[model samples]
Target: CPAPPPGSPDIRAIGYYTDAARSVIDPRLKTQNDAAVKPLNAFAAHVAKFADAYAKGADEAAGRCALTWLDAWARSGAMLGRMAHVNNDQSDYMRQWTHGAAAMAYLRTQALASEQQRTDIETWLKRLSAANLAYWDNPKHKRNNAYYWTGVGIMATAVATRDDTLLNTAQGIYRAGIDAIEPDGRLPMEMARKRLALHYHDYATAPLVLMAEMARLQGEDWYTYRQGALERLAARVADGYRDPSWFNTQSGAVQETATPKASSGWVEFYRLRSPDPMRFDAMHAAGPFQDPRMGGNLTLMAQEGIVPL
Candidate 1:
C-alpha cells in the first residue's frame, strides 16, 4: 500500500472533485435533509474508500470492494430518490461500461504502467461501448431501465478521448431516454412500476441531470430547449427533500440503484452545475465505493483518465 507521490494530478484531481465542493460551495444541508439523506452519506463514504484504497496501491482489494458494492447498485436499478426491486441484467450489457469508471479510478491511483495495461483497458471500454451501440441499434438492451447511466459511460469516454463518435452515441442514447421521459420529467418504467407519481421523476431526471453535466463539459447540450429536464430535476430533488414522502417508492430498479455515496457525489455534481446542494442532501449513503474483492466500477468521469495512462 504505497502512497501516491505527493502532488500527483491523480491526488489533486481527487481533491478537485471531492474537496472542491467544500470551497465556497456552501454544502450546508438542512437538518431534515441531512437525516433524510443519511443513507447516501454511507454510500459516499464507500466511493471515497474505494478511491483512497486505490490511491494506496490496494488495487486488488479496491477492485473487489468496488465490484461488490456495484453489484448492490446493479440490483437497485433506477428510481426516484428512493429504492425499488426491478434491476436490469445488462451484465453483458454493462460490463465494459464499469471498466471505464474503474480505469478513471486507476488513473487516480496514478499507478498505471505498461502499454499492455493501457491497451487491455482501452480495448475493453471500446468493446463495452460498442455493445451499447449495438443495443441501441437493436432496442432490447438500449431502452431498458436506467439507460441514462449508459449515456454516462459513453459521454465519459468521449470526453476523455475527445472522440466525437463516442459523444454522439452518448447523446443519442440520452435522447432515446428523453423520448421516454414524461412531460413532467419522469421515466415510464419507474412511474408505472412504483405506482408512485414522483418515482418517474427520480429515474428519468438523475441521468438527464448527469447528461447535462457531460454535455456542458463536452460542449454539448442533451435535453431539448423545449423542456428543461435539468432545472425540473432540481425542483424534484428539493421537493423530495422537503416532503420526504416524495422520496417514496416501494422498491427500486435493483440494477440501477448505485450506493448512496456515489449517488450523493453525483448529486453533488448538480450542485456544481446550479448551486443545488439539496440534491446531494436528498440522496442516501447505502455504502462506500471501495472494491474489496476485485473489478470495481468508478464513475464515468473517473474512467476517462485511465485510457490515457
Candidate 2:
C-alpha cells in the first residue's frame, strides 16, 4: 500500500449537471467531466477486461490484473478521499456506481486473489461503501435511483466483506425502493425527470434487479418482496421502450426513447429466475448488453455462468 503516484486522478468532487432538474449535462464542462471520471471509467474498463478474460479461460492473469489495479486505487485512496459535490450530490452518485462496479469485479475474481489482495481490496471497497452509506442513508437525501445505486454498492460490498449489518442496510434500501413503485408500476421520483422519465426508470431498474439477484445468492427472497412490485416496475419500463406514449402521458414530456447501454443487463437475471416470454423478447431485441457500472457485459457474463455473489 504505497502512496499513489504524484498526479494520480482523484474522484471529482464538484457537480457538473448545470440544469435545474439536474437531468441535463453541461456542455461547457464535458471535457473536465470526462477527465474527472476517467479513473472510475478506467477501473470499470479493467473490470470488463477481467470479465472477458475470465470468460475466455484466462482467470489467473485477469485476476492478477484486476487485483493489481484495485490495489493501486486502494493504496491511493482513490474514491475514498473525495467528498462529493460542491453544489450537489452527483459525485457521491458516481462513487456509489463505481463502488458497485468494483465490488462486482472483486466478487467475480476474489477466488483467484491472494489473501492480502483480498483483504486490501475488500477493505478499500468497504470504506468506499461506508462513505456511500453516510451520504445516502441520511434522511435528507432523496430516495431515488441514486439511493438504489448506493444500495447495490453496499450490498455487493457487504457480500464481498461478509458484513451482515451492511447487508441488512442494503436490503432495507431495496425494500424502500420496492415500496416506492406505484400500483401502475411507476417510480414517482423517476417520473419526475420529465423527458427522461422512462430513462430514469430503466436506470432505477438496473440496481433493483442487481440487488435482488445478489440477495438471492445470500438466501434472501427480495424478488418477492412487496408482492411482486419489482415485476410491475420492470414491465412498465419494458413497455415504455416499446411505446413511450404512456410515459409521455404520465410524465407530461416527450420521452427519450434511446436505450441506455447495459441498462437491460439485469434482464438476464430476471429471465433466469422468472421466465417471461415478452421480457425475454425485449431483452433479446436489446441484445449483447454490457455496462461497467452494472458489472461489464452481463449478457456475456450470464452466458459464461458468472454470478455476482
Candidate 3:
C-alpha cells in the first residue's frame, strides 16, 4: 500500500504478499525509489548552480566548464523520462530539477557552446517539450500548475532554438495555467493543500511570471489572459505577505509558515512587464534579487541595465 493517508495508524502487518502490499506500503520500496533519484536532484541543483553562476559571471572559463559537463550526457534525450510523473511525485521532482537546470543553462550559456553542443541541448529540450505536452494533455494531469515550469523550460528552449512550434505550445500551456486560477486569485489545485496552499500558489506563480515576461519579449501580453488574473494573483499573494495573520487566521493556526515569505525578483520581474510600481515597491522593499532556481541575478535578466539600489 502507498503510505497511509495523512492521519492513519501504523498498520504494518504481513500476511499474503498482495494483502500486505495492499494494506501497508513497503518502506524498503519507498526508500529504494527515493535512493534511486536523490542523486539526480542533487545533480540537477549542481548544474543549475553552474548555469546561474555562468549567466551572471559570464566567466569564459565557467562557460567552458559547463560545456564539459554536458559533453557526457549530451544525447540522453527522452530516456530521462520527460513525462515522468503525475501528482507531483518524485518522478516530477526528477523532471523539474533536470529540466530547470538544463533550460536555465541553455538560456544563459547556449551562446558559448559550439553548434554541435547547442544542437545536442536543443535535442534534449525538444524531447522534453514533447513529453511535457503529452503528459499535460492527458486530461488526467492538465489541470495542475506544474505545467507552468515545464512550459518555462520549453519556452526558454524554444527561444534558444527559435522553434516557433515549441514556443506556441508553451504559450498554450500558459493559457491552461491562467484558466486554473479562480476569480479570487486562488489556484484550485494549489488551494487543495490547505495550510500550505498559499505556499504552492507562490510556487506556481513564479513560472507564470517568468513565462509572462518571456511571452512579452516575444510580443504577446500573457498577463491579459484570463482577464488579468496574472496581476490579480500577484496582488493576492502580496496582501498575504503584508499580513501573515490573514494566513494564520485562514489556516486556523497561530503560526503559518507553509508558504514562502517571498521570491527574489518576482515583483520587479512582473513590474518590468506590467509597470506596476506599487507591486514593485511592495516586493522589492524586502531586498535585492536572489532566487537560485531562477538562473541567478534576475535583476540583470529582467531589468536589463537597472542595478539594485
What stretches of model 2 exceed 4 Å from their correct place? 1-10
Runs in model 1 with CA error above 4 Å?
A: 1-90, 93-97, 103-114, 141-144, 195-204, 215-227, 244-261, 275-309
TM-score of candidate 2 versus the correct structure, residues matched by position: 0.91
Per-model TM-score, in order, reads 0.53, 0.91, 0.76
lDDT score, candidate 2: 0.76
Higher-scoring candidate on lDDT, 2 or 3: 2
Per-residue lDDT of candidate 2, residues 1-309 (tens digit): 122232243456456666655567677576676776776777777776675676567357776677677777776777776554656765777788888888888777777778888888888888888888888657898889999988877888887778999898888989989999999999999998888898889889889888887786688878777767888888887788888999999988898658746767777767776546466567556778878777777787666655532
Candidate order by decreasing lDDT: 2, 3, 1
Q: Candidate 1, residues 1-309: lDDT per residue as tens digits? A: 222111111100011111211211123333433453333334434534565555445375664454344334323331111121122232332232343343333333323323544444444445556655554565554364446666655665566456788777777766766666455544545544432334345444555555565576655555454356555655664565456344444223222222243333344445445545544554523222223111122242333322222
- Looking at model 2, report the run of 10 residues with the lowest lDDT sum: 1-10
Residue-level lDDT of model 3, residues 121-209, one tens digit each, is 77877766676556565666545557777777777777778889888888887887888777777776665555555566677888778
Model 1: ten consecutive residues of lowest lDDT: 8-17
